[PDB]
Design a protein around this nucleic acid. Structure first.
Ligand SMILES: [Mg+2]
Ligand SMILES: [Mg+2]
Ligand SMILES: [Mg+2]
Ligand SMILES: [Mg+2]
Ligand SMILES: [Mg+2]
Length: 906
RNA sequence: CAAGAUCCUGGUAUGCUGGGGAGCCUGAAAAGGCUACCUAGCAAGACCCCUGGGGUCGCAUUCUUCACCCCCUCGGCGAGGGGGUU
DNA sequence: CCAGGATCTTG
DNA sequence: AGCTTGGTGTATA
DNA sequence: ATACACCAAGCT
């Protein structure tokens, strides 16, 4: 089932996306777009709030579990040591709250002459010290902990502050003595400060160190006169700690293969999608003869570096619009970026030629650079300097600050001191960190007395993801006969599109969202696939030519500001002649909707089973009146089934409204369990809230996010009714379905699971009547194709959105209640509408009506009724292959299905 | 040539729930609250090895399970991975 | 939150 | 009654 | 710090 063709693979790697293209080639010209797909991934991020990956959250949870296990073992070993020593540990209950602290205080203060009292207090103090021992460096052993200075300087400062605050001296000032005195004198005080957030003054302000607890134990030891072997064993049992080793990590040579993971989340996401696309494309067209990849400036930078980027652009664009409005009030017709550079240099140097004195006006500017552009310089803000005209024609191609000291009319050795002693202002182009970096880089470029080479321009992407992708693609190329694999950076495909008259907005018929300036190509998510298609045309020579054109354009962007020279190469001419039909192929592919935007499905039932907060159980009387919500909150499944048989003897599911009085107060109400009998005065355990919850560890926890929704269809074949059974991981956990050999989308859920407990009442009644059967399953990230008919059940904000954005494909994002599915548009970007909200907030009247609707619509998107979505005839739930084609044949992979015509399972 | 980027390992301090209670505030028929502090647990659980106890795994690898193909590790025989075209 | 490993990949 | 929309809790450092 | 699930008044 394979025919070999000549084709090239284009890979457009992004932070949350990757664009893949298989383009057929005939005579070094594009012939047919075999495949073009944009795949959207999360970057491996599991916690969206903190940016931590799924692997990082799993590792932190695993290490917390290991910490609890070894803490249990260590406390048990201390308990055996205390039993051997005859010292009674602190009891679990029926003791005073301050017994441990007064035991520590009394043992560090006075010698106890009673034998049993001393052993009891010693056991109390030692057990409580092992429960609260403070922090130490984990790579330092017990002996080196014993050799630390005792007490630490942090506890010495804390003890001095406590002595000054409370006007009392405790001798010796140990942590147990001070905490016992504070709990006896100012009750309700809190010892350690609370992270993550009324005038309760905290007793301690620094982190407790292990040497402080060790010194307190030494003071207790030498006050009570304990034997040294006993003290050594107590220290070895309390402060024992496993060393930080490397058990889990494994931490010409062969290149890593496609199936080998690199361990970095976003790179694994991109590589998994790329290896699936490459395997499908090789099985259907044979191997490619060329593979071209680029990587964006993201996907490697940290969240801190992202915060540096947004902290740069907000201050820079505020300063540019401020002096642009000042230049518009100054009479200049066209405000321009180099005019903003010279206005910044007058905002900073206060109109001062350094080399000539002579404060100037706007006419005698004549902007010049410190380093000449032929001699390694560029149009950087550090290199640019304010001039006076007379301080412009005197440099004369010579090195800066080298001929100047060996000449008249100007002096050196005060330039560095004068720049470095200047004051950082409040609001300007640079921030507080960027102004220090600007001053240090200016001084470093002022320190030149010789050549500072050179005018380097040869860009191939060499980051971690870049080298990993090059090694794996070169391994595939050696295994499959690919002629060349080229990985670029930037920044080059935008050039290749703008010199080929390819605009995403014209290509996909996108309405204008910005009132002025150029519309962004990043609004439509298919632009990644278009850039992959364009990337198939690139060769390293023409990529270097386009980079040269971009660099000469941004060099002359400020030169002609106070342009644009076209590329001049036979390779560029041959490439532009060869890519004449690429545009016609792009409109031909876009008009027939062949380009798809898809996301991978998370089908494995792994992750957080429930929420992490334990909650208190409620109690309800058996003989009292039961409402529908109180019957829904019944914790024990046998009692739940017995009350279900009470409210309906033939029924299997609970058919209750949440607010309805289901069954009244009956005084001889008796509930017959299989092994117990519940009297009318007995108390039934209830979940605290009327939502999905499970029993974990003697408490109640809410269910986590839904793993999937099982789609049920009932009614007539021409007017069917639809509902969703939202199944979280807690339903699978309490149903015993998290074992081997279980299809989690079709395995039967018991009625007491929160899925059937909190299903819609129409669905529950139809399943009781036998009319409703499961016709499919929906996961977050499934694509709903509404067909050429589109959405016909729009109302209000969705109507106003679909007037400008007739979106046919929608992505399932969640199931926010029992009758609703949350749908976002597949082709429309997320970061574009988010930062578009930010532009409307800061800048008024800058967005067209469509842009305003997009901004006010994208946060919640289409919180859609299921009955108004699945009632569309011709709606298809599209499960793409790796090439972006909908899987329609029934196999052992998820296939596309139509909710109106899906046959029920089994 | 530093810093990071990804984890990994060992720890700490809170927080939540259950069991308690030092002080305060109510209710006094008795048991409710607040601030702290003490103590146990902190995914559900699975698999060992010996009515419990102890040891290791259990939130990653985005198409679960099933079925086919490929790669790797150990001794047909299980685990790790990978791919599956519409 | 803390220290510190191992490894890449930039140069 | 039923769909729309606004607002908020969520283990964390 | 997110975005998904839940809760609770508005329009119709
Ligand atoms: Mg404890
Ligand atoms: Mg401790
Ligand atoms: Mg792109
Ligand atoms: Mg405690
Ligand atoms: Mg446990």
């Amino acid at each position: 089932g394979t025919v070999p063709v000549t084709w090239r693979l284009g890979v457009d790697v992004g932070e949350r996306s990757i664009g893949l293209a298989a383009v057929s080639y005939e005579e070094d010209k594009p012939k047919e777009i075999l495949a073009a797909v944009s795949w959207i991934h999360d970057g491996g991020v599991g916690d969206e709030r903190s940016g931590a990956s799924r692997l990082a959250l799993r590792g932190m949870a695993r290490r917390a579990r290991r910490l609890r296990r070894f803490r249990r073992a260590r406390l048990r070993d201390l308990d055996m040591l205390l039993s051997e020593l005859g010292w009674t540990p602190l009891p679990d209950k029926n003791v005073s709250p301050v017994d441990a602290w007064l035991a520590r205080k009394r043992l560090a203060e006075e010698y106890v002459v009673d034998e049993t009292e001393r052993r009891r207090l010693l056991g109390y103090a030692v057990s409580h010290m092992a429960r609260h021992r403070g922090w130490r460096n984990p790579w330092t052993t017990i002996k080196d902990l014993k050799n630390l200075p005792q007490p630490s300087d942090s506890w010495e400062r804390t003890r001095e502050s406590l002595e000054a605050r409370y006007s009392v001296s405790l001798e010796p000032g140990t942590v147990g003595q001070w905490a016992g005195y504070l709990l006896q004198r100012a009750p309700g005080i809190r010892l350690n400060p609370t992270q993550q957030s009324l005038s309760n003054a905290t007793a301690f302000e620094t982190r407790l160190r292990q040497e402080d607890v060790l010194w307190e134990l030494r003071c207790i030891a030498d006050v009570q006169g304990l034997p040294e072997d006993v003290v050594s064993n107590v220290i070895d049992a309390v402060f024992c700690q496993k060393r930080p080793s490397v058990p889990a990590e494994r931490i010409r040579p062969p290149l890593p293969a496609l199936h080998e993971a690199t361990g970095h989340p976003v790179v694994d996401r991109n590589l998994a999608i790329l290896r699936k696309f490459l395997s499908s494309a090789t099985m259907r067209w044979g191997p490619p003869q060329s593979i071209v990849v680029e990587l964006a400036r993201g996907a490697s930078e940290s969240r801190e570096r992202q915060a540096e980027e947004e902290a740069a652009r907000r201050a820079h664009r505020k300063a540019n619009d401020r002096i642009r409005a000042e230049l518009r009030a100054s009479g200049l017709s066209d405000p321009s970026p180099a005019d903003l550079v010279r206005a910044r240099l007058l905002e900073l140097y206060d109109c001062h030629c350094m080399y000539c004195g002579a404060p100037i006006s706007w006419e005698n500017s004549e902007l010049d650079h410190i380093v000449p552009r032929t001699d390694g310089g560029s149009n950087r803000h550090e290199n640019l300097a304010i001039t006076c005209g007379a301080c412009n024609k005197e440099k004369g191609r010579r090195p800066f600050a080298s001929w100047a000291e060996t000449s008249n009319r100007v002096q050196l050795r005060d330039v560095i001191d004068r720049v470095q002693k200047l004051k950082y202002s409040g609001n300007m182009y640079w921030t507080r960190d960027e102004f220090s970096r600007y001053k240090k880089s200016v001084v470093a470029r002022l320190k030149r007395r010789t050549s500072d080479p050179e005018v380097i321009q040869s860009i191939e992407s060499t980051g971690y993801a870049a080298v990993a992708l090059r090694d794996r693609l070169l391994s595939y190329g050696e295994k499959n006969g690919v002629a060349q694999v080229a990985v670029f950076r930037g920044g080059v495909t935008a050039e290749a599109r703008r010199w080929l008259d390819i605009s995403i907005e014209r290509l996909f018929s996108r309405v204008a969202i910005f009132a002025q300036s150029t519309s962004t190509k990043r609004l439509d998510r298919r632009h990644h696939a278009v850039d992959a298609v364009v990337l198939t045309t690139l060769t390293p020579g023409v990529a270097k030519t386009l980079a040269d054109a971009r660099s000469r354009r941004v060099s002359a962007e400020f030169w002609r500001r106070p342009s644009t020279e076209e590329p001049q190469s036979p390779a560029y001419r041959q490439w532009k002649e060869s890519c004449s039909g690429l545009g016609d192929l792009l409109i031909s592919t876009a008009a027939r909707d062949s380009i798809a935007v898809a996301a991978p499905l998370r089908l494995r039932p792994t992750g957080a089973l429930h929420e992490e907060t334990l909650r208190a159980f409620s109690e309800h009387t058996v003989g009292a009146a039961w409402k529908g919500a109180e019957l829904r909150r019944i914790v024990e499944p046998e009692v739940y089934a017995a009350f279900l048989a009470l409210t309906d003897p033939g029924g299997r599911f609970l058919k209750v409204s949440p607010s309805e009085d289901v069954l009244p107060a009956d005084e001889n109400r008796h509930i017959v369990l299989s092994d117990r009998v519940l009297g009318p005065r007995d108390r039934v355990k209830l979940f605290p809230d009327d939502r999905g919850s499970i029993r974990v560890r003697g408490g109640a926890a809410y269910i986590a996010s839904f793993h999937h929704a099982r789609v049920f269809r009932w009614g007539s074949s021409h007017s069917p009714s639809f509902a969703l059974l939202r199944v979280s991981l807690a339903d699978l956990a309490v149903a015993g379905l998290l074992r081997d050999g279980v299809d989690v989308f079709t395995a039967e859920l018991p009625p007491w699971t929160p899925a059937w407990r909190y299903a819609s009442i129409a669905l529950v009644k139809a399943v009781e009547s036998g009319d409703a059967k499961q016709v499919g399953w929906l996961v977050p990230g499934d694509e709903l194709d509404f067909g050429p008919e589109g959405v016909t059940t729009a109302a209000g904000d969705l109507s106003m959105f679909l007037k400008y954005f007739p979106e046919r494909h929608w992505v399932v994002t969640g199931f926010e209640d029992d009758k609703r599915i949350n749908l976002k548009p597949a082709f429309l970007s997320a970061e574009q509408a988010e930062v578009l909200r930010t532009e409307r907030s800061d800048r008024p009247d800058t967005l067209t009506e469509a842009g305003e609707i997009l901004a006010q619509f994208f946060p919640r998107c289409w919180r859609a009724t299921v009955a108004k979505v699945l009632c569309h005839p011709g709606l298809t739930v599209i499960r793409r292959t790796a090439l972006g084609q909908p899987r329609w044949r029934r196999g052992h992979l998820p296939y596309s299905w139509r909710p109106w015509s899906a046959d029920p399972w089994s």
